[PDB]
Design an enzyme around this catalytic site. Structure first.
Site, PDB file in Angstrom:
ATOM      1  N   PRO A  66     179.189  56.817 -42.756  1.00  0.00           N
ATOM      2  CA  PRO A  66     179.067  58.251 -43.027  1.00  0.00           C
ATOM      3  C   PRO A  66     177.639  58.741 -42.877  1.00  0.00           C
ATOM      4  CG  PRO A  66     180.376  57.152 -44.701  1.00  0.00           C
ATOM      5  CD  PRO A  66     179.581  56.097 -43.977  1.00  0.00           C
ATOM      6  N   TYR A  67     177.526  60.038 -42.623  1.00  0.00           N
ATOM      7  CA  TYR A  67     176.254  60.735 -42.475  1.00  0.00           C
ATOM      8  C   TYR A  67     175.288  60.326 -43.593  1.00  0.00           C
ATOM      9  CZ  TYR A  67     173.288  65.077 -42.700  1.00  0.00           C
ATOM     10  OH  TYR A  67     172.286  66.019 -42.773  1.00  0.00           O
ATOM     11  N   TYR A  68     175.647  60.632 -44.836  1.00  0.00           N
ATOM     12  CA  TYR A  68     174.782  60.296 -45.958  1.00  0.00           C
ATOM     13  C   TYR A  68     174.689  58.804 -46.261  1.00  0.00           C
ATOM     14  CZ  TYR A  68     173.122  64.849 -47.515  1.00  0.00           C
ATOM     15  OH  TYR A  68     172.432  66.038 -47.611  1.00  0.00           O
ATOM     16  N   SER A  84     170.984  67.268 -37.783  1.00  0.00           N
ATOM     17  CA  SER A  84     171.592  68.316 -38.582  1.00  0.00           C
ATOM     18  C   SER A  84     170.550  69.355 -38.988  1.00  0.00           C
ATOM     19  CB  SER A  84     172.255  67.714 -39.824  1.00  0.00           C
ATOM     20  OG  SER A  84     171.347  66.916 -40.557  1.00  0.00           O
TER      21      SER A  84
END
Ligand SMILES: [Co+3]
Ligand SMILES: [Co+3]
Ligand SMILES: [Co+3]
Ligand SMILES: [Co+3]
Lengths: 119, 216, 151, 152, 217, 119, 156, 217, 152, 120, 216, 120
Positions: free
Chosen positions: G106-108, H110
């Protein structure tokens, strides 16, 4: 940031590695003949204690030498030194499918004291 | 020229430019590497077969025994503290009628270079590294080696600072042989454990050889 | 040759082995099980015991660049830039699963040698990039290229 | 051992992450089909002898009641001349195609092929088969039992 | 809950019966026949051959005829009176010797001598076994715990046509004076396939994991 | 389209398969002891002659029976019957990597006459 | 019905798993098997994905996890206090982690792993200290001593 | 029910604090700052620009200076007093026009204007959005329900360095006489990213699926 | 131009390395087949409407002489009653199975199926088809030519 | 061995055409233009020409296109039963959850045999 | 010679040898195919634009209307019962300022061959067949076609025996144009629906063309 | 042994901001607003923030955004060199071969440090 590129050569020249760490681990926690189980410690980022040995029990057959754990040496931390042990495992204790026909087969590898606990 | 050769020059010239090591150091190391081979190891096994006292030393203190064949793990290398990657803790695994060893480095390619030379391409393969420790009988059979089921096959995984060489048992058909003659049949493969010495066989079993783009 | 085509066939059909192929595209934390977490955070070099097929082992001639790479890595260690353990951690683990099995053995050794120069700031990434450009120009301008190509 | 159990689960899981050069095929042009690929795609799926594979801890498996019923149905269809075993093998182990051949269970293919022969030789229309399947599902739902697979 | 497999099985069976392809009785008759099958007859054939040199010669030369001696007539034992549709009527017995050891497989499927041996093992039907045995028999057999001298001829028999095989292993040591029943008792299903050899005191196949069925027979 | 569901039973009842085809192949083209090479005939749609045997040479050890080829039987064509032979191959002739240590290992399987040619 | 449509969409997504392909596993191939194209692809910087073909997906929002907020705060605080700059973080987090972790986790998850990473790489903590801490954290969970706002201590 | 992520998060945070890299106070301070963030300031900047030609000019030429008007000083508002470490201090406002429409993305990660807009959407961080927008903007925007005339210049802005962007959409029809608050109300987060345009009566981002967290903030 | 070509080749190559959880299927037990997988495996291959796919620059393709001949053969077989187009579609776009359906070329499936109908309806034995293929290859290999495909 | 009538289709359709040759064989249509119908999710084992994407959706019949045996029967050589075929228009929003309201008037039209239809 | 060419010859020779169809039949079918193309469909559209009575016929009875452009769906093909694959139920989909059609066969490649010719390679692609029905706006935009959001885009999936051609709305700037001039701008792509007719545009938009090894 | 200067960034940027703290450190800019430039395909081993999709393409500089060390250097703790960053506008057709002429005015704007630029 400066790196002491002469440290290793200065303490190892004419002596060798791991000979340069002799006596720095103190008294060994275990001895030849002792039964030990491999602790499944976190492997995040690095480890030289193979996954296939975790949780298995073996027999110490030799205190091979003293040295900083690879987990520390690999990141430039050689301040702590510990005993390394050569452990012998019965193949049937590592692999569930191992045939009884080859009941005497074994596997020998070295593991630092931190991963060992009395069986 | 390939991308590997492009990058190799970039890295080498950069390291020398920044004074990390000299062109001389590089030439010196390649020279040292060029001198490495399996003969010293073969001679160690031969001497052990003919000298029970030496054999005992081999089994207990490989580093000391190695000196007898001209390989000082500490002083032979250009560093004077052993090669950085092979270290200075050679152990000799002695086979017996009920024990046969075979070596591997599941984590990489850890090999006793100082006394044996460079590791075989297949020894460094993920395949060999994955299978030997778990299915030794099967892998060895592929190499054409089979041992009695009661015999203890011991796989040694060189995962730390120790490097191993295998001292196979002296084969039949060598009665009256000299040290020189015995050494000739102790091949690189015998010292790794995937083969056993046989009279008349003085080279590793022939197998495919992948050619390099630009060898030397 | 018939046998050659037979063996080529046996190897080719392997490419067509059916599978449930799930591409991963940055899944949410709720899609990561403990099992997957341990798998993704594994140390790439720890392959002992993994199932694999029988393969006809072969020897391989050493490339001149491989010999030079090995010498460079040992010389960097000899002169204190790093220890072999630091090399192993960076070369056989830090490279990641994909590069670990996708690139050649010595390719990882070489990449990691370049890596230590930058990570310990002995050279800036800019100097490395500039050098690469120089080597390519050297090869193009026909100015030779060490023992890899004559002038 | 819980630890050993996690170790083995780990060794099995990492296989899913084995790097590869994965090229999806989406009806390539004839010019992208070499002789080698033509032979590979037109092979009979059941001919696997000699293909490289890994060692696996072989296990026995209990027989499902439906598997026994399926086997009996296939042999009875042969006994009564709907097909010969060879016709069955060809349809069951080859005609089903590579994906279903290795993706579905052994007896799943036997069963699918028994349904297949009924339709291919027109003893039953596909419509009748589809309708029958709806019936079996309605029989289960309505709580009207299902042979010895579920009491009414 | 009933699986998609059970739904389809029921649909297929009822349609076949409804269309008069086969009868409800035929189906029950076939299942009853299958229930009577097992490895005992084949084991007796081996025991008998071990005690009768003439019967052994017959086994090796004419498996179908030899099979009659143990109550299994490949042609008339099955409900069809023309052998089972899938196993056919050509059983061959492979006799091991001090220099020859056989092991069987059906690389194309699961071909097995059902009439005299019973149902095939789950692993015998696996793509894995079918892929590896013919090429790496030594390694596969070793996995089963069976190893033979390097000079002994290991022969893999691939049942790809209408012949089915059973392996007649060499009589083991320590069976002196044993009766037919005693000898037959150590000839397990695995010995008849060839992945194991008979041993005194061993009367059951080596223990291996057993995958449970959702709704077992 | 009418499929004959009594044909097979009328041909094999009380006789068996492949017994029911005896004598229909005529004179066998090969005999026990002959050395034959396996032809690499097209496999399109169906074949029971494994790819691993194509182009290999083996020894005929038995004329097992007469029967139409599976390639025909599998599609309802039983008009033609031919001899089937049990053939023994040396493992080293099938697999390039087979070890000389196991030089006596072999593989036996059956092949219809159409796939055979004099070695 | 809703259940029917749900099964239809589930089907449309599942069949994608069976998309046929020529799948070539890579196992440390020789240098001679590495073309220039492959070399450039393997040595690519993982975060540079702009322009790569991808399918349409129904974009969704996602609730923030307590640990994600804590991870974000930790990463900015480490930068705030000079352990690293955001650029060093991005390079380690979105590139150094490698292709597999980059898209598999995951991203985090990557933000967190990298925060752990900077602690060890800059030698503010030894890998040993990190490993011991993880064990300590797991023991808290087990011992029932609870762990921060993720799990309270054993009740009654 | 603690996950591996939470276990590791505690380990990392506690270790960083023990080693004095940052205090427990710093950590709470950063979280408090994040809770003060949202899309309102950016929406108000747009409303103000719509109502003041001079301010609009300032927004276009100097976003950092213009941001001060809505209480967001990119340098001094964050706890560091030197801008957030990850968002930097170079905001640029992209003004749409009848012939120009902007949409923003960070193909490399992002990157988002957090100080003035708040936290980035989950989808904005997706490899999918990061792969597709720069190449097939018309198609991606259409999926979001936004279509512009073919002659209108769609400009995709990739935030790959230290600049962050917010989109100032064109003021829609039917807002004559509207107050700053009424105008800002229709300038949603999605309008500031560029995947939507403001519409009278629409004061919330278009509804889309919401993936729930295991342990939400 | 040269750089742009490398850029686009790169964007395409990286797709091969897209990470995935790759689970090889080796005839799993019935208990490993969920309802979702059952429906997915027994799907009709040609029903692809609605499946997610990427944007691709569509291209035209010249017709191969063999493709034109194949099309004519399939329509002529229908014209003369060997089959109807619907029977062809079922065998051609569904019966071939998932792997061949997307792995082989559009007209490759048309051709394989034309050969298939001749054998399935017993107008030619598989033996006759196999022998004709052998004869054709020999014809080509000997140098006597092959119709409009290769002059002698 | 089976015999296949290779002249049946031509004798029946020559000078008439397909599906014109089945005209009047379905009898009275079960539905009429304007009717709202839901697509039944009938089993599709082996073959079907009613796309999975339409199952469970409701649409409007805009035309009774012709009469013909269902493809599910025709594809297996069974033409004894003929039924009405209907052209149905679906709103895209009813087929795809993600369809944008911005394009609220978009539709999809396709044909489906009577057997898959039920009054909505 | 490819494996496809070998198999094609084998199948054709066997079919002829077994009397399934004649050599004449095969030649006649290829000749028919060669007469096909998009011109008749383009003419039907131009005629419909210039003759309202004809347009009404096109919309209600495409088969009857097709006769006016020389394409009798029943008798033009060699069979005299329509082509086996295209059948005899052509429907003409008329666009309007609030309705634009685009066609696909998600199950295969179903196309109105008798009046339009052979289908484009991309039309047969799994990609086009998967995407058009679900993301028509996005796919059309890729083709360079965009329509107002309120306009009803209707995708027609030719899944049974009906085949479709699209009758686009007549574009501006064609005042006083003859039937030939109007037909000229109604390209194959306009008849499929991935493009709309535009004055001055008389050929499908240029796209890459994949070459055949041995083209017709 | 190694010591990291954890206070340097804060002492330099507090009350000023990043990249404001690097103002004037790049010297004279090599290019100006309006110049046409082509992006050089410099090696990106280990790290780069100049997307592959821009390499070899030509665009127009529309603004000199600020001065700052290149990310290639900053990401490895090397901030001794500072250079100008430029905002560049590319026509979509010059980036993607398949871009439709129907949307001929579409563009893409992004920032690139001076080292990647060369006169077009
Ligand atoms: Co190693
Ligand atoms: Co079988
Ligand atoms: Co970002
Ligand atoms: Co179609």
């Amino acid at each position: 940031p400066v790196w002491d590129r002469t440290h290793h050569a200065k303490m190892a020249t004419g002596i060798g590695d791991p000979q340069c760490f002799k006596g720095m681990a103190g008294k060994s926690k275990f001895n030849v003949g002792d039964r030990v189980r491999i602790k499944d410690l976190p492997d995040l980022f690095y480890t030289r204690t193979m996954t296939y040995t975790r949780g298995a029990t073996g027999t110490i057959v030799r205190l091979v030498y003293e040295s900083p754990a690879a987990e520390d040496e690999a990141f430039g931390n050689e301040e702590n030194v510990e005993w390394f042990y050569s452990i012998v495992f019965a193949q049937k204790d590592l692999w569930p499918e191992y045939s009884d026909t080859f009941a005497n087969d074994t596997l020998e590898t070295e593991i630092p004291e931190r991963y060992l606990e009395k069986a | 020229v390939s991308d590997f050769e492009i990058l190799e020059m970039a890295v080498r010239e950069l390291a020398i430019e920044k004074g990390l090591f000299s062109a001389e150091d590089h030439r010196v190391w390649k020279d040292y590497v060029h001198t490495l081979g399996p003969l010293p190891a073969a001679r160690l096994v031969a001497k052990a077969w003919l000298d029970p006292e030496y054999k005992k030393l081999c089994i207990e203190d490989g580093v000391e025994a190695s000196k007898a064949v001209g390989v000082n793990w500490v002083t032979s290398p250009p560093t004077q503290f052993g090669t950085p990657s092979d270290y200075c803790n050679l152990r000799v695994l002695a086979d017996s009628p009920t024990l046969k060893h075979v070596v591997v480095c599941t984590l990489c390619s850890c090999y006793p270079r100082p006394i044996l030379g460079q590791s075989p391409e297949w020894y460094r393969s993920p395949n060999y590294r994955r299978r030997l420790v778990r299915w030794p009988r099967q892998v060895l059979a592929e190499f054409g080696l089979q041992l009695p089921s009661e015999v203890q096959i011991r796989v040694a995984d060189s995962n730390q600072k120790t490097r191993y060489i295998v001292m196979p048992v002296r084969p039949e058909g060598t009665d009256g042989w000299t040290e020189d003659q015995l050494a000739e049949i102790v091949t690189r493969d015998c010292l790794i454990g995937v083969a056993v010495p046989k009279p008349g066989i003085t080279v590793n079993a022939k197998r495919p050889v992948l050619k390099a783009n630009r060898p030397v | 040759s018939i046998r050659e085509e037979v063996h080529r066939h046996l190897g080719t059909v392997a490419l067509m082995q059916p599978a449930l192929h799930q591409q991963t595209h940055a899944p949410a934390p709720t899609e990561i099980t403990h099992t997957l977490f341990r798998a993704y955070t594994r140390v790439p070099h720890d392959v002992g015991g993994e199932a694999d097929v029988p393969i006809e082992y072969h020897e391989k001639e050493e490339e001149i660049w491989e010999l030079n790479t090995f010498a460079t890595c040992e010389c960097l260690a000899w002169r204190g830039v790093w220890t072999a353990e630091e090399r192993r951690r960076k070369q056989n683990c830090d490279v990641g699963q994909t590069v670990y099995l996708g690139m050649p053995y010595y390719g990882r050794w070489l990449l990691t040698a370049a890596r230590i120069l930058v990570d310990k700031q002995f050279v800036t990434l800019t100097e490395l990039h500039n050098k690469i450009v120089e080597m390519r120009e050297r090869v193009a301008s026909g100015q030779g290229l060490g023992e890899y190509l004559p002038p």
